[PDB]
Amino acid sequence: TVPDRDNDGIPDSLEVEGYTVDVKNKRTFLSPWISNIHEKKGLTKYKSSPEKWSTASDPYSDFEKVTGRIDK
């Protein structure tokens, strides 16, 4: 498998080097930052720490904060 230290759902290399979230038909997919695809659509580029479940130490993980699976 691919490593995930903090167990939030994003792999470590994506957290260290960059990732984003795109929606293709009606399904969202967490993908690494490609500056050709994701920069034309105006997506945001995120980085976070690979060993904290929540990088800002609040009770919401990085995966929930970027994918909308959060308290609204």
Binding site: V2, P11, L14, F29, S31, P32, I34, I37
Partner: protein, 63 residues
């Protein structure tokens, strides 16, 4: 046709190598499955036995 295939084969070479690196870097393989779902199928057929057949067709000529 022949003219496009003979002047700029480095671009098709670049396309295949970039698809190869997207297929085998394990952190982002699903990028290829999402944004190019038939290049993913091409590389998946090529990995599940096509590489073996190209190796055999070269090793037969090698002896």
């Amino acid at each position: 046709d022949i003219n496009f295939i003979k002047e700029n084969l480095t671009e098709f070479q670049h396309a295949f190598s970039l698809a190869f690196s997207y297929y085998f870097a394990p952190d982002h393989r699903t990028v290829l499955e999402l944004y190019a779902p038939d290049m993913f199928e091409y590389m998946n057929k090529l990995e599940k036995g096509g590489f073996e057949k190209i190796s055999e067709s070269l090793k037969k000529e090698g002896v």
